[PDB]
RNA sequence: AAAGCGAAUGAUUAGGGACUCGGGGGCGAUUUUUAGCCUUCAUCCAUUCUCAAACUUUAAAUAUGUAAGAAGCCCUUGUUAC
RNA sequence: AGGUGUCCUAAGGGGGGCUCAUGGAGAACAGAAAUCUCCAGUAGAACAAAAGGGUAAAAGUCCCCUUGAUUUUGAUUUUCA
RNA sequence: ACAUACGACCAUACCUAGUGGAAAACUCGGGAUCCCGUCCGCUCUCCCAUAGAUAGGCCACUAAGGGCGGGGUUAGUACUCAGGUCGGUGACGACUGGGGAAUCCCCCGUGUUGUAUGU
């Protein structure tokens, strides 16, 4: 087909939702900071529920996003832990997917006893060239119907590139 | 299930916005404050200097506003700098300064005030404003215009203020402050007056050339392919622009001709009307429906 | 003593119409006014400065002052047994030039040319309006237009 | 005033189609979400019987502002610190 | 059918960037309800307080700088002699 | 006639789906030294105009498309101004001289235009 209709990785974002503030959040920030190499961003709580023990405007989560080759290698490491196997329902109608792991030392980070163990969430966004049309400030417009990704295409792309299995 | 939001009742109550806001081209909040004038001054016009950028060109105009539309007083594009010795970097800071100066001279000549109000004539990185000139033991106030930047961001070092700096040196009066020019230090609130001089003559491009050629030769020749084919080096750009400056203030109405196909206005109209498709008629549209029924009915 | 506020009773008058909210057309700010013009007042709900009182909404007056962003208008108000002269300041978003005097300003210049054309030629003309007159006599032909005879209809139930 | 509700906000009568993971009751091993067989409420869709002083896309009659010249119109050109 | 005898150094003034309520589909613990991503979304949100009007590159929201909530007096509008 | 910049009226211009686009323009596009800004050169800002592609944005056409705009019918109907020692126990109604609407339903259409520079 046309050279301008090839899929690629837009960005990869990973977040850790600890659920409380304090030393645990700070150590949950250090693991992301070390892994990505960038400064992460704290996220507060919009609601207030006493069942979860959270109130409004107190930090309970940390996340960060990466783009380019760095995203590709980190996505590779997570799929390695998942041994390149994913469920069909992990793919959305817009053409994205994600998964999660229960332990951050599995990638191999030279375990430190003074920082505990955390799990994290993986989510990556697919795209095509020419997506600037809906993101630029001037003459912002809407991407055409034939130029957007579907569930069948993105699962097929995953099987060809990573040689994984989805059922 | 869930409610369908975009149903017929949604469409019936929908109110569209102004057409050029749907196209995302004009900011009507700012436009009102730009063009409106005091009723004390009855029909005195307000002159706007609009500047727009494309991928490969710079657009500049001097505009007034009327009830049924705007009126263009002068224009000066960047591709017209070809007939002055400039052929590369047509959308950089130095080209913006040159195309601004061209319009200022082109406007003053049309008004008849070119002999007075010369300008600076020695582009220097200082902050000055055009003053009133004395003639026949009397003073005359300079021509006045205001900048219209559109949807661009007004950060320190943008090219919109490059066009303004050129027009200001051309002889027009344009009110401004200097805290937005390249080489302004916000910490001490001082202007270097030499970094601005470098940017006027395109010195930031030249230093990129010599640095890039020393540390990455492959990238240097892949990004400056057309620059080296004409034997343009980092030591010639300054004299190249200074030559264009004095040529511009000698014949601002020099004509430029491109290499695109050339025809006449009537010839072009005949050419275009051939690649035009006409709407169907009522009889044709009804006959298509009748044919479609036969197809579907016989498809079973 | 009932409640009497400045904007009491203006629920529908000061409201913008259906599908007519949002941006104000900019030709409103480009018009020009001179002392002696005839304008009418119409309050725009989206502008809260230089607003006139609800009495003057829908009146017509004459300009007597011009300032940076507004005009002064003269209106006559009836208070029981007399008229009083009022002077109100209105921002230009609420005023609009009136077509009340355009018919007069069109007849004046049309009379000038007809008078001079007739004077040059030598045949007098009318130069003033007349009310509609009763019709004149004429004949109506029955050819290929034969009349149709009608009669009233009997009563019947519809539902 | 009248009008409207297969038009927004409110009120309100009745069937039909689509549906099951929303609920309830059950029947083929209650096996089992097995949406297996049903089932009733719920939800969505195209229809259907009636309404509004503090509802509305529309919208009268009667009443109401201004104008219909000489203090008007047109040609030329004198003062000012605006 | 309802409201007032207060409240605010910002909840006053200027500039700049962004888009709200809600729904669908996805992600370790995580579920009806925590945090992250995409699509649709005419205002169905928000603007101290009663109700009505008004507002979408704002009048909402976040960020930066400030005190036009300052001085001297006159004209005009509503209730009205 | 076509394209771009600045506009006027502000859906006959909006929303959904499908097929085409000579020339030039517009666009996507390539690279982060300098000015500048971000968790991330995504956005904003700077440098190149070579390379690639009309895929999308943009233009044009199609659909017994939804909406919108114009007209017919509804209908001289509903309502209303003036009148009578008019009818009727009343509720309410008819007539004389005038003014005069709105749905359901049916048909048609799907932008017009100013200044400047070009193809
Ligand atoms: K009351
Ligand atoms: K109606
Ligand atoms: K209703
Ligand atoms: K009248
Ligand atoms: K209070
Ligand atoms: K403030
Ligand atoms: K309100
Ligand atoms: K008073
Ligand atoms: K295209
Ligand atoms: K195409
Ligand atoms: Mg602005
Ligand atoms: Mg009252
Ligand atoms: Mg105020
Ligand atoms: Mg009624
Ligand atoms: Mg503010
Ligand atoms: Mg603002
Ligand atoms: Mg239609
Ligand atoms: Mg009567
Ligand atoms: Mg009587």
UniProtKB/Swiss-Prot annotation, chain A:
Keywords: Ribonucleoprotein, Ribosomal protein. GO terms for cellular component: ribonucleoprotein complex; ribosome. GO terms for molecular function: structural constituent of ribosome. Transmembrane segments: none annotated. The keyword Ribonucleoprotein applies. GO terms for biological process: translation. It holds the Pfam family Ribosomal_L5. Component of a hexameric 5S RNP precursor complex, composed of 5S RNA, RRS1, RPF2, RPL5, RPL11 and SYO1; this complex acts as a precursor for ribosome assembly. Component of the ribosome, a large ribonucleoprotein complex responsible for the synthesis of proteins in the cell. The small ribosomal subunit (SSU) binds messenger RNAs (mRNAs) and translates the encoded message by selecting cognate aminoacyl-transfer RNA (tRNA) molecules. The large subunit (LSU) contains the ribosomal catalytic site termed the peptidyl transferase center (PTC), which catalyzes the formation of peptide bonds, thereby polymerizing the amino acids delivered by tRNAs into a polypeptide chain. Belongs to the universal ribosomal protein uL5 family. This is Large ribosomal subunit protein uL5.
Swiss-Prot record, chain B:
It holds the Pfam family Ribosomal_L5e. GO terms for cellular component: cytosolic large ribosomal subunit. GO terms for biological process: ribosomal large subunit assembly; translation. It is found in: Cytoplasm. GO terms for molecular function: 5S rRNA binding; structural constituent of ribosome. It comes from the Eukaryota. InterPro entries: Rbsml_uL18_euk, Ribosomal_uL18_C_euk. Keywords: Cytoplasm, Ribonucleoprotein, Ribosomal protein. Component of the ribosome, a large ribonucleoprotein complex responsible for the synthesis of proteins in the cell. The small ribosomal subunit (SSU) binds messenger RNAs (mRNAs) and translates the encoded message by selecting cognate aminoacyl-transfer RNA (tRNA) molecules. The large subunit (LSU) contains the ribosomal catalytic site termed the peptidyl transferase center (PTC), which catalyzes the formation of peptide bonds, thereby polymerizing the amino acids delivered by tRNAs into a polypeptide chain. Component of a hexameric 5S RNP precursor complex, composed of 5S RNA, RRS1, RPF2, RPL5, RPL11 and SYO1; this complex acts as a precursor for ribosome assembly. Belongs to the universal ribosomal protein uL18 family. HAMAP family: Ribosomal_uL18_A. This is Large ribosomal subunit protein uL18.
């Amino acid at each position: 087909q046309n050279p301008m209709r090839e899929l690629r990785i837009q960005k990869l974002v990973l977040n850790i939702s600890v659920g409380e503030s304090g030393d645990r959040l700070t150590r949950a920030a250090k693991v992301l900071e070390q892994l990505s190499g960038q400064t992460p961003v704290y996220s507060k709580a919009r609601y207030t529920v006493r069942q979860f023990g959270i109130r409004r405007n107190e930090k309970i989560a940390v996340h960060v996003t990466v783009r380019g080759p760095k995203a590709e290698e980190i996505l590779e490491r997570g799929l390695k832990v998942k041994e390149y196997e994913l469920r069909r329902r992990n793919f959305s109608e817009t053409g994205n997917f994600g998964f999660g792991i229960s332990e951050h030392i599995d990638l191999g980070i030279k375990y430190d006893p003074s920082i505990g163990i955390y799990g994290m969430d993986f989510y990556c966004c697919m795209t095509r060239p020419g997506e600037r049309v809906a993101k630029r400030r001037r003459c912002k417009s809407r991407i055409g119907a034939s130029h957007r990704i579907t569930r069948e295409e993105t699962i097929r792309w995953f099987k060809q590139r990573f040689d994984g299995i989805v059922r | 299930f869930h409610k369908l939001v975009k149903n017929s009742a949604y469409y019936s109550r929908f109110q569209t916005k102004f057409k050029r806001r749907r196209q995302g081209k004009t900011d009507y909040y700012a436009r009102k404050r730009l063009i409106t004038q005091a009723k004390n001054k009855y029909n005195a016009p307000k002159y706007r200097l609009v500047v727009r950028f494309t991928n490969r060109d710079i657009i500049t105009q001097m505009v007034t506003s009327e009830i049924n539309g705007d009126k263009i007083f002068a224009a000066a594009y960047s591709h017209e700098l070809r007939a002055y010795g400039i052929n590369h970097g047509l959308t950089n800071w130095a080209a913006a300064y040159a195309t601004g100066l061209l319009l200022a001279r082109r406007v003053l000549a049309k008004l008849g005030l070119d002999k007075t109000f010369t300008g600076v004539e020695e582009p220097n990185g200082e902050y000055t404003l055009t003053e009133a000139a004395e003639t026949e033991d009397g003073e005359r106030r300079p021509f006045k215009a205001i900048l219209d930047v559109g949807l661009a961001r007004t950060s320190t070092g943008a090219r919109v203020f490059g066009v303004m700096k050129g027009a200001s040196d051309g002889g027009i009066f344009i009110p401004h402050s200097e805290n937005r020019f390249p080489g302004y230090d916000i910490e001490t609130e001082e202007l270097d007056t030499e970094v601005l001089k470098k940017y006027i003559y395109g010195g930031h491009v030249a230093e990129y050339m010599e640095t890039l050629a020393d540390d990455d030769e492959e990238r240097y020749k892949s990004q400056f392919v057309k620059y080296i084919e004409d034997d343009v080096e980092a030591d010639s750009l300054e004299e190249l622009y200074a030559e264009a400056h004095k040529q511009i203030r000698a014949d601002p109405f020099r004509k430029y001709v491109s290499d695109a196909p050339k025809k006449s206005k009537e010839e072009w109209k005949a050419e275009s009307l051939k690649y035009k498709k006409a709407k169907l008629s009522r009889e044709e549209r009804k006959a298509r429906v009748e044919a479609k029924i036969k197809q579907l009915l016989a498809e079973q | 003593g009932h409640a009497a506020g400045l904007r009491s009773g203006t629920r529908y008058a000061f409201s913008r119409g259906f599908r007519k909210h949002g941006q104000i057309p900019l030709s409103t700010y480009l018009r020009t006014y001179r002392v002696g013009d005839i304008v009418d007042i119409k309050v725009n709900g989206a502008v809260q400065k230089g607003m006139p009182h609800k009495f003057y909404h829908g009146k017509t007056g004459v300009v007597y002052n011009v300032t940076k962003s507004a005009v002064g208008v003269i209106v006559y108000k009836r208070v029981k047994h007399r008229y009083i002269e009022k002077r109100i300041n209105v921002r230009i978003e609420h005023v609009k030039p009136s077509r009340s005097r355009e018919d007069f300003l069109r007849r004046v210049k049309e009379n000038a040319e007809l008078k001079k054309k007739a004077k040059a030629e030598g045949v007098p003309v009318q130069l003033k309006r007349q009310p509609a007159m009763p019709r004149e006599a004429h004949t109506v032909s029955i050819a290929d237009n034969k009349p149709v005879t009608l009669a009233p209809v009997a009563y019947e139930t519809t539902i």
